[PDB]
Amino acid sequence: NDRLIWIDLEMTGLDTDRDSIIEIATIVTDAQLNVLAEGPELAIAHSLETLEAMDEWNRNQHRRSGLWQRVLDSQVTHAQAEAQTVAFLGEWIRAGASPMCGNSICQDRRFLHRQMSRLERYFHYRNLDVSTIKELARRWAPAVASGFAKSSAHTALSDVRDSIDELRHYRQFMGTLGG
Ligand SMILES: [Mg+2]
């Protein structure tokens, strides 16, 4: 172990039962949050009809980021993206060792469970959600949030990259627990 798998996904919506994963990205860091390697960043093939069926903020966001065009042009399926990610991970850590790390990852895990089971099982059942710390800061030390801002970026790779930086930021104000 001593290595963490960070992941983030983009979806068509919020319904963990109906919506679909359209983009995925992973990053492996050591226990001290140093990036060791960036995994494949894949947009997943979906029909134009599926994209227009999304809400409004969703459509605008993905349009502006360019993900909308990557999805239509993509030739990668859920199974293909799953296989490549698992292969990437296989070169850094054995299955079942690392918790799933990121922001609001419970939501992500529920999507993986349905569309990318093999990848879901590659994770330890434990989650490492930066949101938990964000919630505590918000209630106990509001000022601590003022020092961090998320990247302008939009892709999943920058999002996961921001999650690591966010924890890295909070760690400075965690005292003894921060190490
Ligand atoms: Mg996310």
Ligand 1 center to residue 168 CA distance, Å?
Answer: 17
Q: Are 4 and 35 in contact (CB under 8 A)?
A: no
Could you tell me if 8 and 155 are in contact, meaning their C-beta atoms sit under 8 angstroms apart?
no
CA of 77 to the centre of ligand 1 (A): 20
Q: How many CA atoms lie within 13 A of 158 on its CB side?
A: 9
Distance 140 CA to ligand 1 centre (A): 24
Going from the C-alpha of 42 to that of each of 39, 77, 134, 178, 179, the distances in angstroms are 9, 9, 28, 33, 35
Residues belonging to the active site? 125
Q: Where are the domains of the chain?
A: 1-179
| Experimental technique of record | X-ray
CB 23 within 8 A of CB 43: yes
Contact between 163 and 8 under an 8 Å Cβ cutoff? The reply is yes
**Class of residue 40 by CB neighbours under 10 A (exposed 0-12, middle 13-18, buried 19+):** middle
CATH of domain 1-179: 3.30.420.10
CB atoms within 10 A of CB 108: 22
Report the C-alpha gap between 28 and 12 in whole angstroms.
25
Residues near 152 by beta carbon (within 8 Å), at least 6 away in sequence: none
> How close is the Cα of 58 to the center of ligand 1, in Å?
13
Structural resolution in Å:
2.3
User: Cα(160) to centroid of ligand 1, in Å?
Assistant: 8
